[PDB]
CSV table of N, CA and C in Angstrom, one decimal:
chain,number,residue,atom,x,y,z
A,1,UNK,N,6.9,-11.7,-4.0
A,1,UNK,CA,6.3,-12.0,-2.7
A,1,UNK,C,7.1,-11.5,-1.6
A,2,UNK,N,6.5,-10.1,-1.0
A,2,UNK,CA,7.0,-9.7,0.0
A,2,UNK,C,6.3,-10.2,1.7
A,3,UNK,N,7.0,-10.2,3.0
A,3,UNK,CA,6.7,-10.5,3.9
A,3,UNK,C,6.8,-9.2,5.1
A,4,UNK,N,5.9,-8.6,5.5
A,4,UNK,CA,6.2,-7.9,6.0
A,4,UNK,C,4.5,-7.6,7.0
A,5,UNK,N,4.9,-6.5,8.3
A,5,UNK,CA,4.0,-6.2,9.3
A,5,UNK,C,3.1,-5.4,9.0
A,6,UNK,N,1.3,-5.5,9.4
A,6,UNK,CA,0.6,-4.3,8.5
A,6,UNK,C,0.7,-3.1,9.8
A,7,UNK,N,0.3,-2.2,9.1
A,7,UNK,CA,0.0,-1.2,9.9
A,7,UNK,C,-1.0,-0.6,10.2
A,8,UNK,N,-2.0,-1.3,9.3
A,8,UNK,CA,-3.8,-1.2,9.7
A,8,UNK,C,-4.4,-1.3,8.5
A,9,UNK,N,-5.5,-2.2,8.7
A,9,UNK,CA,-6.2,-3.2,7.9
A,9,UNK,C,-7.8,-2.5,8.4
A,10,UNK,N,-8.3,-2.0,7.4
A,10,UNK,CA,-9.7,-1.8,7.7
A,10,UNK,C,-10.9,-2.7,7.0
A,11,UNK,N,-11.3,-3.8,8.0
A,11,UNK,CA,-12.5,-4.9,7.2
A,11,UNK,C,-13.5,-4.3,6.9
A,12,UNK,N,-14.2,-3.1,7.3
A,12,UNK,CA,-15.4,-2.3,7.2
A,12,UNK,C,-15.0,-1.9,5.8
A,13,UNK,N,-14.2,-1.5,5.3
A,13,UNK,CA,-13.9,-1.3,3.9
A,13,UNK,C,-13.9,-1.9,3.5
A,14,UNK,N,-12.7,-3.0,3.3
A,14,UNK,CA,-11.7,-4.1,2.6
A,14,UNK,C,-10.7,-3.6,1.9
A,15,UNK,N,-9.5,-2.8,2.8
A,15,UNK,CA,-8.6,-2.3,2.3
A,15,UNK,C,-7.2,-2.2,3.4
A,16,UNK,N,-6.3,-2.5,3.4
A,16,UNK,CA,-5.8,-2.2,4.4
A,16,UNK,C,-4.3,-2.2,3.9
A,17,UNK,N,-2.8,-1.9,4.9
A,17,UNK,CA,-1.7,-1.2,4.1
A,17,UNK,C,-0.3,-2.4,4.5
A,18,UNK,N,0.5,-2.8,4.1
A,18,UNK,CA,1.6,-3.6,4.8
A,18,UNK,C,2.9,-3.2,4.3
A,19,UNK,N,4.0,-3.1,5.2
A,19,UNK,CA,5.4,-2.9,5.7
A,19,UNK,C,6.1,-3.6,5.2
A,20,UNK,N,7.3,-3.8,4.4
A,20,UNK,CA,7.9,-5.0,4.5
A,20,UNK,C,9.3,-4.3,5.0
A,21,UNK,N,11.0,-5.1,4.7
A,21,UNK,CA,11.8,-5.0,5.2
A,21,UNK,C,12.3,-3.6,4.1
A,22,UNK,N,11.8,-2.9,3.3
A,22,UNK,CA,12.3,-2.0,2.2
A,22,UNK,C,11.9,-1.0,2.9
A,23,UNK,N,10.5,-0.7,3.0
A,23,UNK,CA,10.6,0.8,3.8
A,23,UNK,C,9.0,1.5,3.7
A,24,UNK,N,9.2,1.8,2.2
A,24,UNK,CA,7.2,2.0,2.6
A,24,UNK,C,6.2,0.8,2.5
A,25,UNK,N,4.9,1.4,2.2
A,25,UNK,CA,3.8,0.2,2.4
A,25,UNK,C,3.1,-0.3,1.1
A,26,UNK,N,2.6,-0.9,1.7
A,26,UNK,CA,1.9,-1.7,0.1
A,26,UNK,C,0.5,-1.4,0.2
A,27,UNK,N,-0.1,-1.6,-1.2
A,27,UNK,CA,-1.5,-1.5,-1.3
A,27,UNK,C,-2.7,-2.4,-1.0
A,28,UNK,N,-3.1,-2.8,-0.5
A,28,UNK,CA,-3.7,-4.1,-0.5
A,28,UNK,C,-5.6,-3.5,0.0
A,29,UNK,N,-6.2,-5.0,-0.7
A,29,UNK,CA,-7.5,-5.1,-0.6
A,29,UNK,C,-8.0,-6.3,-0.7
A,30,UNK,N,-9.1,-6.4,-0.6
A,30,UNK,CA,-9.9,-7.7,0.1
A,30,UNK,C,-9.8,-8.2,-1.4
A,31,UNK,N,-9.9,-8.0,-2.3
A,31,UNK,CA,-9.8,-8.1,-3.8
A,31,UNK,C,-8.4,-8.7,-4.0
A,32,UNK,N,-7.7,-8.6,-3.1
A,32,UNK,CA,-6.1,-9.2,-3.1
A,32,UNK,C,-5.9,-9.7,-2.6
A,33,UNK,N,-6.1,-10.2,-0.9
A,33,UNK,CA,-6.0,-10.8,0.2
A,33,UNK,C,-6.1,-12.6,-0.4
A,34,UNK,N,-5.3,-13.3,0.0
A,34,UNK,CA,-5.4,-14.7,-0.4
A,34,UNK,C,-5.5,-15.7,0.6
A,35,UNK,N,-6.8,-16.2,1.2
A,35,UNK,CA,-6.8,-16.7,2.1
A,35,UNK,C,-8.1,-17.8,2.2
A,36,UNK,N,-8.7,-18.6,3.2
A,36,UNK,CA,-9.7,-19.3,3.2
A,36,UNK,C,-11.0,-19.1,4.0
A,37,UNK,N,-11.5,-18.1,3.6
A,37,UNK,CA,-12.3,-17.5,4.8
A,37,UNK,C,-12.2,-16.3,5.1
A,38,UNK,N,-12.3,-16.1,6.6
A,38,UNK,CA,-12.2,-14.5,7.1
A,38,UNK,C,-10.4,-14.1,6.2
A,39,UNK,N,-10.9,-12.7,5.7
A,39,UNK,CA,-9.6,-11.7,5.3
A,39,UNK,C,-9.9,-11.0,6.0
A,40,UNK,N,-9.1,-10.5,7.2
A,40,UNK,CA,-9.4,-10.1,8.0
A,40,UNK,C,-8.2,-9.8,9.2
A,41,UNK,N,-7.2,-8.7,8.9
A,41,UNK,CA,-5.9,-8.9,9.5
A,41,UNK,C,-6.0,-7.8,11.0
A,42,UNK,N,-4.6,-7.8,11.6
A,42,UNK,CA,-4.7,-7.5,12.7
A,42,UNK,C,-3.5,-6.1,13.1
A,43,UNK,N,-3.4,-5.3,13.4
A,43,UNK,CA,-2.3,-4.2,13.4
A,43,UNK,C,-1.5,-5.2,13.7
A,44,UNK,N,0.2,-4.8,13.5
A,44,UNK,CA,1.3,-5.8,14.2
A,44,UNK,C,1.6,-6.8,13.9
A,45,UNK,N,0.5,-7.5,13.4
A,45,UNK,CA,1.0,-9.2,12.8
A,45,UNK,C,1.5,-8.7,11.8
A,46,UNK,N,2.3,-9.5,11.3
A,46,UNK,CA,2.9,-10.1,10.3
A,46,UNK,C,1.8,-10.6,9.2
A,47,UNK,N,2.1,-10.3,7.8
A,47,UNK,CA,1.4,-10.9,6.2
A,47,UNK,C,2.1,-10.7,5.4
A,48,UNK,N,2.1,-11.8,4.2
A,48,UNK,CA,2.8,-11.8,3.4
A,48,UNK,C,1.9,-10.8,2.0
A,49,UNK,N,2.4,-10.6,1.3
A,49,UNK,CA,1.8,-9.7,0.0
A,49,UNK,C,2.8,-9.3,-1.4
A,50,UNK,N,2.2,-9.7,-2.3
A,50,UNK,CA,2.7,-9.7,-3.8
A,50,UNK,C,2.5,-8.3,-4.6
A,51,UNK,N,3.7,-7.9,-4.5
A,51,UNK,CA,3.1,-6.1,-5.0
A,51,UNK,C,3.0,-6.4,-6.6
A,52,UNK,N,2.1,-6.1,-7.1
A,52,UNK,CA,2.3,-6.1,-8.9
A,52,UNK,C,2.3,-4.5,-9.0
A,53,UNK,N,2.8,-4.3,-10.3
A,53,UNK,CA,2.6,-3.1,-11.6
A,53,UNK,C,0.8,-2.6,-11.3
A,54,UNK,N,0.6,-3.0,-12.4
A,54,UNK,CA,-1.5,-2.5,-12.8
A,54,UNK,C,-2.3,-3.3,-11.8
A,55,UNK,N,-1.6,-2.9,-10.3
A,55,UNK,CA,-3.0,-3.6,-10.1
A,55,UNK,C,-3.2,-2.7,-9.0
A,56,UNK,N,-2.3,-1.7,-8.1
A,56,UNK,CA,-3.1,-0.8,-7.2
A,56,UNK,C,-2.6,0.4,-7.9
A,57,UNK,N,-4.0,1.5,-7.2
A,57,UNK,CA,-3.5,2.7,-7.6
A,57,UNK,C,-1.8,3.4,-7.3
A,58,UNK,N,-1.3,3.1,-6.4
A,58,UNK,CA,0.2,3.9,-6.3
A,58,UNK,C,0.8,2.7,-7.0
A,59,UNK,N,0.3,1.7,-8.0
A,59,UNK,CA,1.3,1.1,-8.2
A,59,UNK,C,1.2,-0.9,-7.4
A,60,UNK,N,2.3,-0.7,-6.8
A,60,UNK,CA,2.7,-1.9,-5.7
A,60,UNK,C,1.4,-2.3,-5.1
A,61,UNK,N,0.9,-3.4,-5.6
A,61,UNK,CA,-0.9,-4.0,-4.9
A,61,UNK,C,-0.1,-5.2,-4.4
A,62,UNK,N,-0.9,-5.4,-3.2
A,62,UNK,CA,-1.0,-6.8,-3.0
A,62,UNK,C,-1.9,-7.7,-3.3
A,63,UNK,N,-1.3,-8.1,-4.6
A,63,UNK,CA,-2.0,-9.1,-5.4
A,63,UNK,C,-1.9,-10.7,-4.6
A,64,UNK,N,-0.8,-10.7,-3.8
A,64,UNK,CA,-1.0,-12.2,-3.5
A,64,UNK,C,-0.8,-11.9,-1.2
A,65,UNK,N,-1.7,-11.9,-0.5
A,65,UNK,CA,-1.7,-11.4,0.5
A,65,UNK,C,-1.8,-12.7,1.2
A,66,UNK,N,-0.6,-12.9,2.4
A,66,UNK,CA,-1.0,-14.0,3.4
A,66,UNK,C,-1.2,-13.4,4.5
A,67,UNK,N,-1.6,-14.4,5.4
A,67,UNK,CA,-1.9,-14.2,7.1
A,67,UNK,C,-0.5,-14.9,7.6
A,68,UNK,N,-0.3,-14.1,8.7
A,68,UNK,CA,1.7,-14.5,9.2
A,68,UNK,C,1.3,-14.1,10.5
């Protein structure tokens, strides 16, 4: 469970990428996003995200994604 800033979230898709304190980005999708309602993030804010092995294509998915 990483915490880190996204750098663009596209909801028209449901895909979007996040930062943490290591250096590149993560995978993430609305298929990972963990939340109660709108998934639906913001450039700049802050979210948390769970990179796993088999679950995005480069690898590092965010399987477990918060709003921060």
């Amino acid at each position: 469970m990483k915490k880190g800033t996204v750098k663009w979230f596209n909801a028209e898709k449901g895909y979007g990428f996040i930062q943490q304190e290591e250096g590149p980005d993560v995978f993430v999708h609305f298929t990972a996003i963990e939340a109660d309602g709108f998934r639906t993030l913001n450039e700049g804010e802050h979210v948390e995200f769970e990179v796993e092995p088999g679950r995005g294509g480069k690898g590092p998915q965010a399987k477990k994604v918060r709003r921060i």
